[PDB]
Amino acid sequence: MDERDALRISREIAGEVRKAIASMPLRERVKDVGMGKDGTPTKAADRVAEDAALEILRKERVTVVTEESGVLGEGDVFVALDPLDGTFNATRGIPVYSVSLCFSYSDKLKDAFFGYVYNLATGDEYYADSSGAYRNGERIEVSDAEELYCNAIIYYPDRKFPFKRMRIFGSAATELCFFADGSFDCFLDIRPGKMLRIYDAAAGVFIAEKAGGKVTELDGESLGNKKFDMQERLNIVAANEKLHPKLLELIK
Residues that bind a copy of itself (CB under 8 A): 88, 92-96, 119, 121-122, 124, 151, 156-160, 165-170, 178, 181, 183
Q: Is 175 in the site for Ca ion (CB under 5 A)?
A: no
Is 18 flagged in the annotation as binding? no
Q: What is residue 238's three-state secondary structure?
A: strand
Identify what 192 binds: ligand IPD, a copy of itself, Ca ion, none; CB under 5 to 8 Å per kind: none
The answer to whether residues 132 and 41 touch, using CB atoms and an 8 Å cutoff, is no
Is 144 flagged in the annotation as binding? no
Q: Is 85 in the site for Ca ion (CB under 5 A)?
A: yes
Distance of closest approach, residue 96 Cβ to ligand IPD, in angstroms: 9
CB atoms within 10 A of CB 196: 17
Q: Is 225 in the site for ligand IPD (CB under 6 A)?
A: no
CB atoms within 10 A of CB 139: 11
Please name the residues in contact with 138: beta carbons below 8 A apart, sequence gap of 6 or more. none
Q: Which has the closest alpha carbon to 242: 133, 144, 140?
A: 144
The answer to whether residues 49 and 56 touch, using CB atoms and an 8 Å cutoff, is no
* Per-residue interface string for the shown chain with ligand IPD, residues 19-58, x marking contact by CB under 6 A: ---------------------x------------------
Q: What is residue 78's three-state secondary structure?
A: strand
The answer to whether residues 233 and 195 touch, using CB atoms and an 8 Å cutoff, is yes
Instruction: Figure out which of the listed residues 16, 129, 181, 200 binds ligand IPD, where binding follows CB under 6 A.
Output: 200
Q: Is 196 in the site for ligand IPD (CB under 6 A)?
A: yes
Scan residues 152-191 and list those touching ligand IPD (CB under 6 A).
155, 170-173
Is the dihedral angle over the CA atoms 122, 123, 129, 133 positive or is it negative? negative
Question: What pairs with residue 63 in β-bridges?
Answer: 78
Identify what 122 binds: ligand IPD, Ca ion, a copy of itself, none; CB under 5 to 8 Å per kind: a copy of itself
Q: Pairing state of beta strands 98-104 and 124-129?
A: unpaired
Name the residues that contact ligand IPD, by CB under 6 A.
Answer: 40, 82, 84-88, 155, 170-173, 195-196, 200
Binding site per annotation, positions for substrate: 85-87, 167, 172, 191
Name the residues that contact Ca ion, by CB under 5 A.
Answer: 67, 82, 84-85, 200
